[PDB]
Amino acid sequence: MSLWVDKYRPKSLNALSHNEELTNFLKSLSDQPRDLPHLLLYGPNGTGKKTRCMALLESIFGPGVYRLKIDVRQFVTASNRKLELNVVSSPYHLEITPSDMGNNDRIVIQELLKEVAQMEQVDFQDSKDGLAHRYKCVIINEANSLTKDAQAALRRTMEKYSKNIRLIMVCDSMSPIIAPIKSRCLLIRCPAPSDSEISTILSDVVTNERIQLETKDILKRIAQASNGNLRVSLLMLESMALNNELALKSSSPIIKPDWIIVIHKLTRKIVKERSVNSLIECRAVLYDLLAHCIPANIILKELTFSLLDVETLNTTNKSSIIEYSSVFDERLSLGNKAIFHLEGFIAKVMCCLD
Amino acid sequence: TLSLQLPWVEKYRPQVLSDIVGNKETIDRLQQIAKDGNMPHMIISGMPGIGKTTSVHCLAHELLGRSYADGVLELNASDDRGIDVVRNQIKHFAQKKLHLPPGKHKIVILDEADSMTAGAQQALRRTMELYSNSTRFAFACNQSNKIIEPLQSRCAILRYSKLSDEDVLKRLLQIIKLEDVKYTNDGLEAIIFTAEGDMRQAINNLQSTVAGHGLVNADNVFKIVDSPHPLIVKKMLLASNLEDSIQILRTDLWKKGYSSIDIVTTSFRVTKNLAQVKESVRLEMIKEIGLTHMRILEGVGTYLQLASMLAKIHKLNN
Amino acid sequence: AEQSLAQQPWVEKYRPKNLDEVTAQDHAVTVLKKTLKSANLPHMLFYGPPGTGKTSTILALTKELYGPDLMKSRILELNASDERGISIVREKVKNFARLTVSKPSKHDLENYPCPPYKIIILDEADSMTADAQSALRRTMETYSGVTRFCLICNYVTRIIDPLASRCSKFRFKALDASNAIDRLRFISEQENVKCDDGVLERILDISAGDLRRGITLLQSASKGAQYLGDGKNITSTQVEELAGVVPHDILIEIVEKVKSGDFDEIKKYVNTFMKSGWSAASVVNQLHEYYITNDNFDTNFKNQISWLLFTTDSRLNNGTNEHIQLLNLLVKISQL
Amino acid sequence: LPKMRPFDRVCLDIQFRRPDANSIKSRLMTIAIREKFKLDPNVIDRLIQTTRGDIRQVINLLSTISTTTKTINHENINEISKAWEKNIALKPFDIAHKMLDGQIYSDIGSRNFTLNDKIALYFDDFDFTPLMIQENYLSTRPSVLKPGQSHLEAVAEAANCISLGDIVEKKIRSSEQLWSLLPLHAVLSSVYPASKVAGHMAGRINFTAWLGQNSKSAKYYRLLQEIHYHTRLGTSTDKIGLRLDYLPTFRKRLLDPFLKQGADAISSVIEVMDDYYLTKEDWDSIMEFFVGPDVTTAIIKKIPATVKSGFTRKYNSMTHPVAIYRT
Amino acid sequence: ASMLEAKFEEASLFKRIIDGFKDCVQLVNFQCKEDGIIAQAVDDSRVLLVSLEIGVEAFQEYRCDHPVTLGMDLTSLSKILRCGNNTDTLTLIADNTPDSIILLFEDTKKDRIAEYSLKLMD
Amino acid sequence: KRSKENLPWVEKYRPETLDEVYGQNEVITTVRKFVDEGKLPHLLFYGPPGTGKTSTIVALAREIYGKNYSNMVLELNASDDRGIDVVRNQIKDFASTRQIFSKGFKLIILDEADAMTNAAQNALRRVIERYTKNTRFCVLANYAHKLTPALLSRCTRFRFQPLPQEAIERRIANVLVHEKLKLSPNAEKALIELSNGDMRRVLNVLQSCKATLDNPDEDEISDDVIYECCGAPRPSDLKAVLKSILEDDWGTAHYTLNKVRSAKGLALIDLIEGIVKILEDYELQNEETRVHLLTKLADIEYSISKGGNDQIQGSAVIGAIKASFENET
DNA sequence: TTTTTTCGGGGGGGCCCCGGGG
DNA sequence: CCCCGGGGCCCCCCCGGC
Ligand SMILES: Nc1ncnc2c1ncn2[C@@H]1O[C@H](COP(=O)(O)OP(=O)(O)OP(O)(O)=S)[C@@H](O)[C@H]1O
Ligand SMILES: Nc1ncnc2c1ncn2[C@@H]1O[C@H](COP(=O)(O)OP(=O)(O)OP(O)(O)=S)[C@@H](O)[C@H]1O
Ligand SMILES: Nc1ncnc2c1ncn2[C@@H]1O[C@H](COP(=O)(O)OP(=O)(O)OP(O)(O)=S)[C@@H](O)[C@H]1O
Ligand SMILES: Nc1nc2c(ncn2[C@@H]2O[C@H](COP(=O)(O)OP(=O)(O)O)[C@@H](O)[C@H]2O)c(=O)[nH]1
Ligand SMILES: [Mg+2]
Ligand SMILES: [Mg+2]
Ligand SMILES: [Mg+2]
């Protein structure tokens, strides 16, 4: 069967367990959906933002929103280059990720969204108010990755055709979003689940999966080892259960992703050997990490938060490390070559620490 | 009035190789070639306004004479010089039969050859070797690094040098005598200083000064012609106190109509050629000037940014 | 017809339809309204902060100048959603500007001023490249007798100096709780919104000069109140909760942790805090308000914290990680 | 050159090199005797070094100089060689070697090799010079370090300026097309970082490794995109979340059974791949993503051949669903 | 359709007139009076000037109350004029203070009517 | 296109003849002398926006020719394609061909030539030089770094300085007489101060002021009207803000800045610029104070150019000023 | 001791198809 | 009625500073 993270995902607003206040707010928004403004759901990753968006769409249109199909749209650049975009669609809504093509997301925004917004949904999709669903929903996933030109294009398309289309954009952070677009959306904060709620969900999965559990403390450790990420907690529970023959014990170790282990080993190496040869080996390790689809910003974040965890360092060294991380995060945000900035950050950290 | 008179830069263009001032060795060598013959393929390089095209045309004329019409093929940037042109028209001209004096050959003058594609230059290689007995090639360029090395190996290099004050003064005095111009030595000194070794600019400035106010003196010369702004930028960047540098930037650059982009680019160039200051300090000043240039290119161009750049430069030079 | 706008979001529903419905932009609305009679409308450059009423103002001006019928034949609107390269500027805009003005009808001439010139509205012109803007220069001047240009932008510095010189500049002021309160109160009364005293003022203060954000917040509060269905008045705390404003208790806890000065404790507290989803911009603004408006600190501390907050805000405006920036700012303040 | 890569090994590669002055001296002396102008034996080596061993260029030099000056002696070699000096553009490796030298950055050497020379050297190859500098700035023994400065601090400063130059490069190659900033880039990416770690090479000049790494990253990203959109109907995440979260668990549900159970686990793996519309090529691509202690190359190469053969045959013999129905 | 109503003998005539100078100049300006139509066009290079002086006798009927000036683009005019048959009658219609010129194509034998309006240029 | 009364003041008052161009006495006299004796060289008018370059060249062309100059000159601008093909074909034919209408020389005006590509400029060199006998070229520019050195060397340079106060006063008087308007002396001084040497700005602001007045017949344009229509700070407001920042505590300075800004919605950028201008006159005893002021204010201006948090920006301005002036003891 | 991104312009190769001639 | 000349788009390939 499917993974436990996906097999037990709630499919309605009434099936949501944690964050009851947000559920009430979404239910309020769904009471009279014919005047729903554009929505921007922001919060930590792995909290259930997309699940809540799907639940709201189901409550607005119906269960048919969960019948999804994948199609391919063709786009042509000014240089005659051809690109293909995979679009997830339902009889009531579409889901797009314009950042898939990179800097060409503006073409998608200016053509596909314009075409959808300029066409009227004449389908007699009888709603809960006795009138057929009129507006069409488009979910722009990973809006934080959109280029500023695409957002500028979206600005007026959001306003001119509000009668025909409503946008539900999901993002993890609002800093990359431009103020004009942020002003055109209703901001919805999605807090991460607490440890108790994560433990309750994990216990529900355990009971449904007939997983032998020595004590409930293991679920507490799993929840505390995820840092609010529910997807990580569920996948970790499944991995631990499989690795222990569905017989989780109080002494069962907590599993960690391979890239996390590599980053921690790199942190230890940096803290131990502060030399140019160590910097060359760190460059090799960074190349290895980056070549396998590990985002540079993620690497920088984990490296910064792992170096600060070392108990051999003093306050001044940690302050210097965090300052260098702050500077080089902006450097990364304003550059193409990530390895250059990562190597510069490692070099500065080695200089200060030594 | 709807009938203009020819400017002195054209009315007094040297028509013989002996009337070209400056680069005595090269001019004498070209005169010897014109008197003897066996003209080799040549590439003449140098800065604008020194007499490369004039020298080439004078040499071709003195070498050919009545056969100049049928023995010279002059192509310039204003004329198409693509691969097809090189492979058809130049080849036909080289293969064309013309009966010339015993020691004369056909001439192909590719003016402004630095604006030619690498493919055309490559197609211009063998035509110069299989037809050297009938046609010779003269190129006139400003940047000599834009001509592919294979062609440079096939031609004699003539690197014209910057004209000195004496040559410009000599030619200007000759023109003054031929036009009966009332002048003051200070006026000629100012004209030479503002010309910066460009004979065309010197002659144009002299003509404008005479036609606008008459007597060629320092006051009249400087009334039309302004001092080179690169020297003003150099002076601003070499000041001791930030107050003096800001004053120079204000009363000499900002209020004279000079744009911020021009000021920053000139500062970058001058600092690049500021031999007096050490290399490291020059590099830091270049970094600051580049930051200011990037700020200006984004639309934030104001006297405040230039003042901050000057303050940072002064802090670096302290 | 009526239902088309009666079922629309409040921001679109209550968009000004005439020039007298603009709340706090009289200094330019008066000029644009007297040009209705003077018939000498100049080239306009509308710049200001987001959500101040530029697009609405220009649309109302066009409606009042031409009318419902002649509008479409006398308006060329181009925004960031259309290709606006140098080729487009040279061909399409130039061609439209070189055409004769459409013939007004008898009804239009009798009921509307029908000015003798057309209008080209380049919205979000700040995104246009410099080359296209330069190409527009002489096109603006040559055909001034038949065409007028309106460039609408947010960052005035992105418009090349020549075009800014050719266009009369109009700055749209921020809509705060002092000049835009009337419009919000009118909207609330029309929508039958029951709110306590000061709730609208709090909404406008949180909006920070954006009336669209205030209208959206009011609509969200009305939806919540209707769903709950107790018949009580909306409270300010609800507005703050719906506006992503950190509770004062958490801010005081952060301040106390910073005062403690321990790096590990601050790091742990920030890690816990970042799990709630609070935006870093709101936290930075609240910290600035708390620190700059406190008498328990000396001049040097305020001088340093102002620059620290400015640097953090500038860094966060580029799309940087919020956790790292917030932790660095808090540590630096703790070491002040 | 890439253009002539088709002629890699389909032809005999005969190499002609720059002829030495010893053989060309005889020809030059013969021409000197023939054409009635003087050329001392000590001048040929210098004249040949002027033209980078181009016999045609040397003959042209002699012909031109003989027009007016019939004597070529040690008194006039300097002027002739300076007027006819050949200027060839250095190639990536040569550019990197020259730039990372501590003699051109000295107070005496800076006059012979000015900042203009370095900036022009950058422009010889403006697409590879910054990459070569970034690749070869950590393999030198410096000789331009300030009192109290160590190698680590110098390399850190060079890396900071390299990051700034990378930002400038991003600005240059954008929609605005800001090529006027190219000179500044030259200083930020190539000249300044080299000036802080300049010295003597401690090894060989290695070619840029970022190009192949970028190609590998693009390949793996395309594979991850294909896998993600093959599983979008059964998962709630993005491609990054799929790589960081789902794949570690998918491995335990797809590869571990073979290691622990054997051939009997083929059915379970087939089932799991069927639940997420996963193909055999998708399985391989997924197994190629793991790094660190999770590398599966040796583990997969160690699996018994019978299990893999049975897995492949059973998958091919079975009918499987489709996620994207390309019409 | 008050000021100018001019029907040609056949659309082929006006077609031929237009093709005679459509590759020389781009923008033309006709000045239709009660005596006929006269147009002067200058080339971009300012080296060639084209002058057409069609007469009243070239039309089946020609009515023009007041002198009316029409500025037009030759590419667009030719493109529109290529939207008709060779056996039809073409009439030019212009109204008060023209903002566009109407080109009406009529075929009595086939009872075919086609309309085409081109916006004039200032 | 009804009449000239339905045109913007920037276009309604475009100098027709060369005698209506003010502030460029030297250039106007020189070009008029050249036209008189018939010694017109290849001209390069370099200057900032709105100084009278396009108007000057158009007036010169109309003076050389009659009212038919439009057909006797080749004027190309950025709005028209000017690639290498255009230079090779159209400009070359125009220069090498006689005049259709008259029997005089020909003028080519390459306005906004700074937007031309380097290849076109390089091709223009020999086109200019060869046909000099019967053709003359005029190039109008705002930035000189975009013009190739060869083109600059081939043309006589004339620099259009920013318009002095005197010419601006004369033109304002002419506009007031034509429009039947009254301008207060302090209003005139404020208008010239905000002009920055640009007459287009003056004309636009004067039109806005006329619009502001209830009845433009009797009412007078006071400085209050200038600041209301331009929405710019008042000198007293800038002085008060600087005094509060430099001589009061943080609370008082913050309150004063907020009150001044909220009184009439004053923008932060305008206040920063005015304070910079005011401090320019200040005689600082330490160079560090001026250096820090300039650097920090430039950084704040750059931050403002991209938006951000306005309150934090104002607090940063206050703190930077206070810290910089703390070094004056 | 080897090998990347984007607009705009320019160049150069490739057809396509109208027109005109036979 | 059929073949040939030569205008016009379409597609691709390479530069970009002093
Ligand atoms: N050595 C010279 N002696 C006398 N006049 C000169 C000399 N050089 C330039 N001139 C004058 O300036 C005018 C132009 O000289 P040119 O030959 O065009 O300079 P140029 O070096 O060919 O310009 P470039 O490099 O193609 S921009 C001549 O007609 C002369 O009147
Ligand atoms: N001056 C105003 N008066 C009344 N409502 C306003 C005003 N300004 C904005 N709004 C309200 O906010 C909504 C949007 O206003 P807009 O005209 O779109 O602002 P904007 O200037 O175009 O924002 P930007 O700079 O393009 S993001 C309007 O429909 C109004 O409901
Ligand atoms: N010397 C002047 N005298 C009178 N009015 C002037 C003067 N200069 C500019 N103006 C006014 O400003 C308007 C524009 O003048 P122009 O000279 O055409 O602008 P411009 O110099 O071409 O702008 P640039 O340099 O291309 S950005 C004129 O119509 C006049 O109304
Ligand atoms: N039991 C339970 N699980 C949830 C809930 N919300 C999210 N999840 C689980 O968390 C997983 C990831 O959620 P997702 O929305 O994709 O994360 P995000 O889009 O990055 O915020 C899902 O597979 C769900 O199983 C909830 O309310 N109750
Ligand atoms: Mg020349
Ligand atoms: Mg808008
Ligand atoms: Mg102009």
Residue numbers in the entry:
A (entry chain E): 1 to 354
B (entry chain B): 4 to 321
C (entry chain D): 18 to 353
D (entry chain A): 460 to 786
E (entry chain F): -1 to 120
F (entry chain C): 7 to 335
Paper excerpt:
The gap in class 2 is much narrower and unable to accommodate dsDNA. In the intermediate state, PCNA adopts a conformation that is a mixture of protomers that adopt open-like and closed-like states. In the intermediate state, PCNAC disengages from RFC to adopt a closed-like conformation. In contrast, Rfc1 and PCNAA, which move together as a single unit in all of the structures, are only slightly rotated and adopt more open-like positions that prevent PCNAA from binding to PCNAC and closing of the ring. Notably, the conformational changes in RFC in the closed and intermediate states do not arise from changes in nucleotide-binding state. Densities corresponding to Mg2+-coordinated ATPγS are resolved in the nucleotide-binding sites of Rfc1, Rfc4, Rfc3, and Rfc2 in the closed and intermediate maps as is a GDP in the nucleotide-binding site of the non-catalytic Rfc5. Based on comparisons between the open, intermediate, and closed states, we propose a two-step mechanism for the opening of PCNA when complexed with ATP-bound RFC. In the first step, Rfc1 and PCNAA together pivot outward, separating PCNAA from PCNAC to form an intermediate state. In the absence of its interaction with PCNAA, PCNAC can rotate freely and sample a range of conformations, including the open conformation where it binds to Rfc5. In the closed and intermediate states, the double-stranded region of the DNA is resolved extending from the bottom of the central chamber of RFC through to PCNA, while the 5’ overhang on the template strand passes through the opening between the AAA+ and A’ domains of Rfc1.
